[PDB]
Amino acid sequence: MNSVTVSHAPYTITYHDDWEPVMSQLVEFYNEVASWLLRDETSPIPDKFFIQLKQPLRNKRVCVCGIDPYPKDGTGVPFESPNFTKKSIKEIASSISRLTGVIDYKGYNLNIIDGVIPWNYYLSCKLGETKSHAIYWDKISKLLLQHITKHVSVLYCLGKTDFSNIRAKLESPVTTIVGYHPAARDRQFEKDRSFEIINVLLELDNKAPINWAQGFIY
Amino acid sequence: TSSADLTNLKELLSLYKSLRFSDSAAIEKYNSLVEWGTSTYWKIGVQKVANVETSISDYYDEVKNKPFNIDPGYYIFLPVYFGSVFIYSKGKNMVELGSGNSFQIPDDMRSACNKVLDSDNGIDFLRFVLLNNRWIMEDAISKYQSPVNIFKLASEYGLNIPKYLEIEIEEDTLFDDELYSIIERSFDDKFPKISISYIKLGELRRQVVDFFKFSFMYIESIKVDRIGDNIFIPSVITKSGKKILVKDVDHLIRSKVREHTFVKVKKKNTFSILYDYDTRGEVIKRIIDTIGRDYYVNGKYFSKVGSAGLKQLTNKLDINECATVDELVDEINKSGTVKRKIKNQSAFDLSRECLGYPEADFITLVNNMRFKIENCKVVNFNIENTNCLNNPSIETIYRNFNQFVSIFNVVTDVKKRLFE
Amino acid sequence: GAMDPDVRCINWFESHGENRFLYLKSRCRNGETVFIRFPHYFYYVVTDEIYQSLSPPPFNARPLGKMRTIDIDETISYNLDIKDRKCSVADMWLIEEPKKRSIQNATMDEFLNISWFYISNGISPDGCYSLDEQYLTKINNGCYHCDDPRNCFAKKIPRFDIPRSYLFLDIECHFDKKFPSVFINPISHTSYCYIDLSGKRLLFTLINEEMLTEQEIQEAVDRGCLRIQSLMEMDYERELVLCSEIVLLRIAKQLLELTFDYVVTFNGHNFDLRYITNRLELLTGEKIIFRSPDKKEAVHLCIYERNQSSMANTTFHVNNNNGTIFFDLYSFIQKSEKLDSYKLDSISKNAFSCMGKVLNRGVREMTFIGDDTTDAKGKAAAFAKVLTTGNYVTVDEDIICKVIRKDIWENGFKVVLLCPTLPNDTYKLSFGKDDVDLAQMYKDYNLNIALDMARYCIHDACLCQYLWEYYGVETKTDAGASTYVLPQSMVFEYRASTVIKGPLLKLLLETKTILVRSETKQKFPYEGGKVFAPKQKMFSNNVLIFDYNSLYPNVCIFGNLSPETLVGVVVSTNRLEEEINNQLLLQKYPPPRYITVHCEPRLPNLISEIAIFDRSIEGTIPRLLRTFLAERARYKKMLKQATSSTEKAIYDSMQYTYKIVANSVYGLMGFRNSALYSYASAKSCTSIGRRMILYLESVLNGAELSNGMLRFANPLSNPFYMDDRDINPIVKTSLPIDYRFRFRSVYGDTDSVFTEIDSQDVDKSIEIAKELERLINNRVLFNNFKIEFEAVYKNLIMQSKKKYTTMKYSASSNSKSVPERINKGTS
């Protein structure tokens, strides 16, 4: 782990050595955007804006991309709810249970599966409003996503609309699966076969399939 | 995203798993699914191929070059023969191992394979060996049954099977030349046996052994032996008269055999086979010039002038032999599918088929000529390029290119009279 | 008050809400801008069996009659057992459906439903119609409910003109060293070019107080400037109104909201308009708010970019639905132009460029005048129009000098320029690269610099109206509306293979021909990479330039090449089967009905690929191409039958739009992602063009004029099938017997053929060319092929198709005249 000082909060950004070639441009962009970002309250807090940089990627293969942190209960861990109360992760647990048969469980963390890195495109959002803070974030978001897809085998995106043109912003072609967001109407995310397709494409890449059950906590 | 996409991915992955045991149809479908996947998901771990390396080494191991030990369980003994090796799969045809092509096979063997594969869903493939135009199904692998029930099924279906030997081993014995010879004799066949395939009940992998030693001898002559209608198998002898065995004329070219020289050969207890891995344009003409200009590459055989005629049309047509062009159309009407076969192909197709003409050589030679054509029939011809004459197949096929043009006009007027 | 039934369309667009509609922005003559709502739908045609087989009734359906269904697959054949083209005649029905009732088997799916709306209602895009009040129920103030467009657009009326409010605008922002960013680089100054319905060329150039001193602000207020600090305090008529960034952006928001008819910018939808968006959100909380006229939606400003491929390019746009075709100059001009650069300097250089006559000499300030007769009747008027604002002039195309004093009356200008005194006969005045370092002036920003750069920006944003009437973009856009059968909003927004589908659908609805495909395309393009090499570079004689009147657009009429008149493509792998098939085909399909065409073998193993086309019936693509060239000829005739200047606008635009659309068909035939795809069609069109080019070169090379008869190297025989013309390579020449001259073909690429004449007398070249055009058109060419002589190049120094210079002589001139000096590719 390495840490780097920015011109504003947190003034210290810890990251794993995989993220090393990103730090300079990340620092520049944040020093540019920080105060106007600070103009609103964020979920998670500004202090949490860089807990997704310490996670190593060399053992991460399937990147589950979330467009933004939640408007409330922002904790910096993508899709995460400390009490497992978020509807999105509830649907995620439902689909993974249906694939895996796990009838009884208490929670599901996407961050405790080897090969899977839950990820945020836009690092923050304003309280109760989605993607309003994307404007200050564009450069940082694109930077992080490109550095990530340098390594991750599979890119999965929750929400077809919010990920309409993620292909253009990312230069190197990569295994990309664009799926429903869990907030999709008529339970179309239940109909989503995303994870099985993900495992199949991993095997097509001669890669280890994801044991999504490891994310379950009983 | 869709479960249909999931099924497409599963099918493509299965095709990727079964790609050595593939054909042109399987390769085409695999390429199409790869295209769809790489367009949809912007990247796919597998790409397109065209050569298609075919191998069964996944079911076999490294060959035993020295005595080894056996002990547990029961063993099923199957022999390894000499000649061209082919593999027949589900919905696929015979393909030559290593250089997979679309070989031509009779209908009896084809129908027997079709029925023995339609009997049940659990057959990986059917393994066949061609030796002196004698089809021999050597083995067939599966994950549920054993090459005994399918062997009985094939025996009652009409195609030959090797006598499978079932033996039980209890003590620790060193499998050596003596026991190898004993089991070889236990099969009781006069065909060449190069190796032994022994399997254990439950093990999918099948390992083979081959005991041999080096030997060197003088080559006195290379001569063809009549083993079919217009089909002659080249062969060589020794000073003592020993018979050296050959798979294909391709092997002879690949071996760079020299007249009145010495060669290396790994000799078995019963037979001996010359060793390959000794260019092609040089050898294909040197061997013909040694044997004589009046020898043309008759497929995998060497033939004389091959003056052919009408009955050569009948034999490949598999119709009643006749020396009259009038009889060439009578039974065709009574033949429900012979007329279908003739009509479906082109005139040039039947022309090349009836005369044993290699494709590439003939096509190049023709593309080095000039022609006069009247009433859909060739009336004269002339060489446009004499550089093709460097290739012996070119000049030899030209020597009887009169045979080709005669049979070609005959075929065309045959089509015309079949209209009548 | 009341509604004026006489209206003209100036903009169409489609909605964005759950209930989507068509809102039309029309203009009455008296000065009204009226909106009409049209319930949008979805459009499909199915075979009548499918129509009867669907139980839940479609909302509305209309049959089109029994239209034959034509398969257009390409199927190679190694011999002559070529199957007849699949042809099923059946009745189709056109369904008007509100919801995406996707059907497994529905036909005509590759089009756009708005084109179908146009054709279904017969509503002409730019057409002025006498709308029906009984068919127009008022819903909003200015918006009306039109349920039945067919019975509403009942009576059409002749084209008249209208007052249109072309707003413009363009700004500048203080960058540091890198590109100006909204978060870090503030606005330097904006400058608008408001043009209301009155035609008042209003101006106001706002300047940022923030990056200047309050004392400097007071100085400027004392020097003429008016200062306001709010949105309510603004008056348009002043020029330098001063305010801070919040005030500037609030006023801009008040502006872009306005129900404008057009809005123009250079580069704007990518950098500048988005820049207002982001800077106004960063400082204030009010996104720029566009609204539908009927007050049922309210989108916010949206920047999105749409790609194209046919050089990798991207085009920005904004899907505001207020009513204003939020135009741009950069992308559209780059679509119309294949230029060395598209920097605004170069576009101005090659838009307004008038010749000068020296008036005053001495010191570094020289005064120049240009009257209407200085260079040409017309250059002076426009150039004086664009010399109201500009500051720098490129004299002699390299002397970039700043305007010191400009005097313009109506038809000409007098200008004092800071160019060194030099006794010269004349000069070329140009707007090339500008000589102001905005970066340096920003690095040393002050008051006087602020005012001068404010004038710079007002120039940069009033150039938009000048280019808007130079490139006739309003007229070309209204031409695109009724040509491509699109909304005016998207005349230059789509890609070619999409736009061509309008007239194609009209033609198909006429001939009742449907093009279907059930097989998958294959992966090979239409081009093989043909390279042309000139015979020589330096020419010691005159070169007669001969062109071709729409080479491919006419070829596709001659041979009837198409997808439904391509009966087969025959190949054979070897020479014997090659010749066998050759003679067999020459027997079976006899001329003149068919035509045997040689193409390139598509695969390495093939060597001869005969394409066989039937000219029995003029198909769809040939018929359309004949219609295009015929209508272009008709409009270019009507261009010199009328005197009203508005006519000399509309007819020029329609003629040029037809040229652009017809010329492109050869591409959309061979483009796998085009609705006109037939691989053999493109291959044989290229082949026929190649044969014609080689034929003409053989005709002219080796040709010598014998006394009074022209004796060619080769006879005048048709290259394609049996010919009844006098193929004699001796043709009577209408020149005196003393003429004896020889021709040596020197270059022809695709449609222009260079002809060398064995002399340097350009006048004799022109005379011989005048006779030669008639000679070619009456003896050598045939059927519908026609050419027209282009130019005479004496001292021609060419290196390739693009880098070449010469002294071009016009046919209207003689040896003792003013030749055209051409120099392209000079750096």
Residue numbers in the entry:
A (entry chain D): 1 to 218
B (entry chain A): 2 to 279, 285 to 426
C (entry chain E): -3 to 306, 313 to 829
Excerpt from the paper describing this PDB structure:
There has been a long quest for the structure of the poxvirus DNA polymerase holoenzyme since it has been shown that processive DNA synthesis by VACV E9 requires a cofactor composed of VACV A20 and the viral uracil-DNA glycosylase (UNG), D4. The polymerase E9 is a member of the DNA polymerase family B possessing DNA polymerase and 3’-5’ proofreading exonuclease activities. E9 on its own was shown to be distributive under physiological conditions, adding only few nucleotides per binding event. We present the production in the baculovirus-insect cell system of the VACV DNA polymerase holoenzyme, which consists of the E9 polymerase in combination with its co-factor, the A20-D4 heterodimer.
Here, we present a system for the production of the VACV E9-A20-D4 holoenzyme and its 3.8 Å structure obtained by single particle cryo-EM. Surprisingly, the structure showed a conformation, where the processivity factor A20-D4 was folded back onto the polymerase subunit creating the D4-E9 interface described for the MPXV holoenzyme in presence of DNA. The parts of the complex where previous high-resolution structures were available were very well defined so that E9, the D4/A201-50 complex and the NMR structure of A20304-426 could be fitted into the density. The Alphafold 2 prediction of A20 could be fitted reliably into the electron density after adjustment of the relative orientation of the domains A201-50, middle domain and A20304-426 although for the final structure a model based on the very similar structure from MPXV has been used. The E9-D4 interface mainly involves two α-helices of D4, which contribute E32, V33, W36 and R39, respectively I135, Y136 and K139, while on E9, S177, F179, I180, L278 and L279 are involved. The side chains of D4 E32 and E9 S177, as well as D4 R39 and the main chain carbonyl of E9 L278 could be involved in hydrogen bonds (dotted lines). This interface belongs to one of the best-defined parts of the complex with a local resolution below 4 Å. The thumb domain of E9 is disordered in the cryo-EM structure, whereas it is stabilized in the crystal structure due to a contact with a neighboring molecule. Surprisingly, the apo structure of the VACV polymerase holoenzyme believed initially to represent an inactive state induced by the cryo-EM sample preparation showed a closed conformation similar to the MPXV structure with bound template, primer strand and incoming nucleotide.
